[PDB]
Symmetry: C2
Subunit: 80 residues, 2 copies
């Protein structure tokens, strides 16, 4: 399809790569990185997102993350 | 004297702050910031966390994230 984006996938990916550079800048361990990133996610909720939407975004964010992991699982892409 | 610091307060603070500064510098819209954050958290899993554990870590993250939000919402504990 045709999706014109102000924030192109190149922009997004480079933004992600840049915050990864921040993590690697101090090469924080996964445990500590998950802590920092996790609080940064909630940070955006408590900052930009009003409480009623704060719930909705949290749930969809969870489904997004969970199904991203459930995507690389694949396992025959059926059940059997 | 019986105290154990899991991490350095100023360390964690500066870590979170640095990533926030990245979002600040580029001035990322809510959609872009959440998208970048989500993929970043997942990309950490794609590195040092096998899918076997990744499923549980994702759930652990979902637990922590949602409970952090609800910790602000639920201060009206009297329906009985």
């Amino acid at each position: 399809m045709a999706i014109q984006s102000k924030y192109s996938n190149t922009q997004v990916e480079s933004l992600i790569a840049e915050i990864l550079v921040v993590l690697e800048k101090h090469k924080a361990p996964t445990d500590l990185s998950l802590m920092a990133l996790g609080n940064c996610v909630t940070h955006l909720l408590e900052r930009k997102v009003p409480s009623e939407s704060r719930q909705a975004v949290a749930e969809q964010f969870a489904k997004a993350l969970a199904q991203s992991v459930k995507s690389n699982l694949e396992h025959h892409h059926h059940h059997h």
